[PDB]
Amino acid sequence: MNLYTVIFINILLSLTLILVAFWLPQMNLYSEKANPYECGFDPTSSARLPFSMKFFLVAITFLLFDLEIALLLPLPWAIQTIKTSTMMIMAFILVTILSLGLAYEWTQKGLEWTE
Amino acid sequence: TYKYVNKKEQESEVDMKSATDNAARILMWTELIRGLGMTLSYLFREPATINYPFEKGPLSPRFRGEHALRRY
Amino acid sequence: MNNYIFVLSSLFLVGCLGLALKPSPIYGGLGLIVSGFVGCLMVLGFGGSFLGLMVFLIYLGGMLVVFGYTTAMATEEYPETWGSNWLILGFLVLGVIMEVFLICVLNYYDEVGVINLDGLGDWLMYEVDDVGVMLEGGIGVAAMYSCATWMMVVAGWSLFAGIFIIIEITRD
Amino acid sequence: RSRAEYVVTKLDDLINWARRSSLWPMTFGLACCAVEMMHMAAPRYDMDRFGVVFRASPRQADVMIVAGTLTNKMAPALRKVYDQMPEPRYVVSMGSCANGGGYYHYSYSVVRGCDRIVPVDIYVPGCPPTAEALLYGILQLQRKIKREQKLKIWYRR
Amino acid sequence: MWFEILPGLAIMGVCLVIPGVSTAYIHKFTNGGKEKRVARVQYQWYLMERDRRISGVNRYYVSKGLENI
Amino acid sequence: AGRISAFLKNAWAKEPVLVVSFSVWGLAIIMPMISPYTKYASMINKATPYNYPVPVRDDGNMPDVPSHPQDPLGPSLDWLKNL
Amino acid sequence: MPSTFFNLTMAFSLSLLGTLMFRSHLMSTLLCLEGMVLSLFIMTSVTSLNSNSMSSMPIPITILVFAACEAAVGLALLVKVSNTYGTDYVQNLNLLQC
Amino acid sequence: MELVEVLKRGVQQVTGHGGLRGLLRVFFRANDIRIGTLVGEDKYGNKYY
Amino acid sequence: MFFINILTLLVPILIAMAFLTLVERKILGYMQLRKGPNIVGPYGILQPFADAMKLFMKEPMRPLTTSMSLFIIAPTLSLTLALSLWVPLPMPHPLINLNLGILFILATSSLSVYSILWSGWASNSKYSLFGALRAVAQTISYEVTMAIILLSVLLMNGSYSLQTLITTQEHMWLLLPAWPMAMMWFISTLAETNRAPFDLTEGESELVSGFNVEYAAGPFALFFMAEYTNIILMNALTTIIFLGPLYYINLPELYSTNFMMEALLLSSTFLWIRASYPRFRYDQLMHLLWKNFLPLTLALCMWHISLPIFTAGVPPYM
């Protein structure tokens, strides 16, 4: 109950500041004020057009590496096992293959951003 | 007469000593620590700020300011 | 508090309805983040802890990549929201109405079958070992390191092979 | 006057003090006059000790300091970034070029004073004004803001 | 001079001690003068619930010694 | 093996991070195999009693099972007390 | 439990309906697959907790591991589609009718 | 030891402005509590140090 | 009483944040041979309040190209998450005692990036989109190693509970056995807080103001309040993990005083670092993390699995 209570208060405080910030100040809306900023000149296109991602391969590698750490985060419970040798070999093998995967991608220039 | 600003390319062999000194410099961020030392040394220096408008920047008799018309 | 888990599973249902309508993937990505959070709460509510926090953490990472991919490869001049198209909005409202109807009718016909609005909160936790110590879900997951090592061998291989797979797919 | 008028007057002071004490100019400089603006930020004068902080975004700026010559080609862009400052906003015209065209007043390519493009609160003379002369003008803007009576005028409407 | 930075630091320092100190004192005030009980595992929760049930006042932190048997 | 020594020396000067990573990885594998304390880690996990030790019915043919927890029979923990 | 599992199965059905009823973006469909994965994760996790089946808790984690591999391949394919056509629209992927 | 010298100069600055009111006046008007030699005063009341 | 305890956490943390804006500006000033604020209040101690009042009295932007729901939500989410990160912190007793408090921190911190991503996207301007896509890259850079660094440390803790770290360090800072991870952890918290030399999502010399460029007035203040609150949080976390403040069961306030001193010091080094270095290029941050930290982090994770087994030093479960 307590965790729910404090997070609601955190939400409540943030939303109150937003309401104050939008209803206290004097406003003056006109078109030139609300147009998008681009260093004093008009944009030549939408900001909604495609924006190329040069690190796209690192990005999807990160998806796999993020499930690798998910497999590592039970380790504090796993070190309590009687089967210490089995746990240790499994953890060593898991870390080593992930290193080999990173090493391969590194030597394939998979960490280099595209030009 | 001229001098080279970045021609220190007398490539030499590396001992264990120098390789370890290079290793320590990379792994322990030693030149980055020297940067922090410099900014730390300024922290304890007296600032150059004057208390304008109670204090003023020095000027000279030649200073060119607001015009006036004079008399005898 | 007797309605707590039903409310959460009801929120989860709405999130998947929003995703199913497929607005711009920007809002689809947001829909999965909220559903992931609601899904974490349900796992917690049933006595979970590690599993709920894992799936939220994994989906927080997963949708960040999808955000990056969306801005590069799945964007239009006017990205669609749930309200932008009257047809999508209507099926959002109709879908929510059909949820209330489906739960209402099923409650009437059986009363204790799939829907048991009279008994909500009485059948969440069934048995609990009151004086136990080693019971948290992380202990169960950790059996991959000792008793279920085959599960970890296949999981590790798929991530390892995945690196070689995605490098091959993406090279020109 | 009344206690409701006294309270309104003290509130004017408080909001005025807040805007005096946190003036954020745009990172915006046109020519040689901008060099003296750098010297006002530099350690001797340290504008930041008065609460004056450059921000690059017009959305996060309160003051525009027109620090240099305003050409015809630049005029629409200067008007754009002025319009994109949220209010309340202020303009300081700095130096002869911005004040009225200066050395280039008679040029085909120059706007004869930025006050043909934006409203101006303070005119700082000089070519360039010294860093200290600019600082004096900034402190004159603060005293102008100290005189604002927007809540008192609202009350008497 | 650098030591003029300290008024802000002291205000920061005071503000960062209050949360730790206030939480420790409010716990003792609301837990019968003792540390708030930590129930990491179900066994600890069971002991608290048993303490609440035998307390006579529905408070786990009101303890009963040999005077009760 | 003078060619490798120059190789390793250059790698140390120029790629020390990778040299440390491989050395640490190799040490982590080696150390459990040569350490005299490796055997105790499993024994300590085995001596932690998370569950109630259910007693056994005495059939008269259990010379090795203690009848009381302070009998001198059963597993001793003196090794851990003086570890 | 009864009502929660009904709602979770409905959540899977909606995500599958989303998968089966394409709009234009391939990425929107890839998100629907992640929705089905998410529903199945919670269903497996809640079942294991409700039955106190601690030996089955590895299985929900393995569901996410292979789903991550499936999602990574899906995104990798989507890069290829976008490179060919400049969008991820599925109507362009029609050369194999003849 | 040298710290004590510094703190004593702080006591001179803090008590050398004409009591508490005089210290508050200069501290809040000028944001400075240094003591200097009085060089003079003009007819308007400005004091030069 | 629990509501009073919420106040005596949130309010002092928000005042500590406000005065960190003052301390930063004075420390940076003095390292630059300036003074910084010394007029608005005695020694500038009212300057934060003036900036706060100014911003909330300013007209907030309603740009025309903006998608307004996410535009409002993102700064709201930013401050909520920043405040929420404090509730499980044991100083030495937390407001909320969590069994997996470290995992709570990672999940909450990981949701915090979406405030940057959505604000930049929702603003629908080019410089804000640039800032959002740098946040995508930033998280990919550091999040890959931050959890493994934590994992290795907590194999000496034996749990994800923050309060257990106090007992783990009863006789020694975790810095001593884990200083190489502490170094990598410290760089990660700089990137995690978008602080210099990794202040890339804002990076004003390149993107004007990046993700928040279209934001004005009070909504802008929420991002700033959230950033300065997080700086204190991450350093307080570094203090509890690696610099175990002295704990005595009969003198809890001693822990709080020692905690504050070390946390104040670690926050000062954040401001000191900002004054000293140039900015990374955002592709270079990715290479720093993935080609230097990640190899060593993986080796050290293997070493810290190996260590408790071969020294028989497995920490207790409870």
Ligand SMILES: CCCCCCCCCCCCO[C@@H]1O[C@H](CO)[C@@H](O[C@H]2O[C@H](CO)[C@@H](O)[C@H](O)[C@H]2O)[C@H](O)[C@H]1O
């Ligand atoms: C291709 C991937 C390659 C990377 C993977 C390599 C994995 C190989 C690991 C080799 C190291 C195994 O190290 C092994 O550790 C175990 C405990 O863990 C030690 O085992 C020792 O202690 C255990 C307790 O834990 C006792 O029960 C056992 O009788 C005793 O032998 C072994 O003596 C040692 O040989």
Ligand SMILES: CCCCCCCCCCCCO[C@@H]1O[C@H](CO)[C@@H](O[C@H]2O[C@H](CO)[C@@H](O)[C@H](O)[C@H]2O)[C@H](O)[C@H]1O
């Ligand atoms: C997206 C959000 C969706 C919100 C969904 C709706 C939330 C509200 C749930 C309503 C369902 C029934 O909710 C509530 O269930 C409890 C069981 O716990 C019933 O329980 C109570 O009333 C019924 C008889 O009327 C009996 O069981 C008993 O007298 C008492 O326990 C309540 O009468 C009913 O109102």
Ligand SMILES: CCCCCCCCCCCCO[C@@H]1O[C@H](CO)[C@@H](O[C@H]2O[C@H](CO)[C@@H](O)[C@H](O)[C@H]2O)[C@H](O)[C@H]1O
């Ligand atoms: C072609 C590719 C496949 C080859 C590569 C994979 C090689 C196999 C490696 C995984 C080995 C798993 O090895 C298997 O481990 C399990 C525990 O996990 C052991 O299981 C044993 O202990 C468990 C503990 O609960 C008992 O319940 C079980 O009855 C008993 O058999 C098996 O006896 C052993 O066969």
Ligand code: SF4
């Ligand atoms: S007024 Fe003088 S100094 Fe300023 S921009 Fe013009 S020419 Fe240069």
